[PDB]
Amino acid sequence: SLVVQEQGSFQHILRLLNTNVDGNIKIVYALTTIKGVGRRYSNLVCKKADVDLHKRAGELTQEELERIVQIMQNPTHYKIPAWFLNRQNDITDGKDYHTLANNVESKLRDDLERLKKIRAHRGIRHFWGLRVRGQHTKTTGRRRA
Template identity: 30%
Template sequence: MARIAGVDLPNSKRIDIALTYIYGIGPVLSKNIIEETQIDPSIRVKDLTDEQLNKLQKAVEKYPVEGELRSQVSQNIKRLISIGAYRGIRHRRGMPVRGQRTRTNARSRKGSKRTVGISRKK
């Protein structure tokens, strides 16, 4: 099993799909990395040579991924909260941040409905 950036890539997947299992690498960045390393995108992870794995590892290290990227995102959110920006207030309240409607919908962000007055059966 190939391990890149602390993530075990699934052996049976194509390399262009397997790279997207790394946090911070999507389909476009995966395609760019594969073009940069000149590896066939249809090759399976289990068929990669050690040389190809080293090339991929070096290419992925150029980008912020996994823990580094997660900490950047959390620092950005903390900054928005600390300066009292509108987006920071929405983060603090656990509400949608990017302008979605909240009168209906937004249940995944707001949590389950809280009833007032009567207690409902669970």
């Protein structure tokens, strides 16, 4: 029932983390465009940064934006329970991170490379491009590439 008319300070698509984020859609499902970011993490961080989730992304302040960025790239300092993380007890240092736009794929490649140079079964499977989770390969994944 409330209707603020508008101001021209609105912006369409913006940029952060080297990602062309689309405005004019609600902030949570907007942020989930980022690689390494899902609905849970996004809703949570937008809650922790003290944001109105009814708002649209393209109508915001750079301060809110950068605070959200900081919370995203440094979660634990803002009281996150450490099991939301996509990469915890990582593989080498045992510290718990949350990999993002390019780091997600880079780390995935690093893991596959590790296993391949290890000559592990999973690594060989990935190297051949087959299925790895123990699925069957008789009738499925035919036109896989």
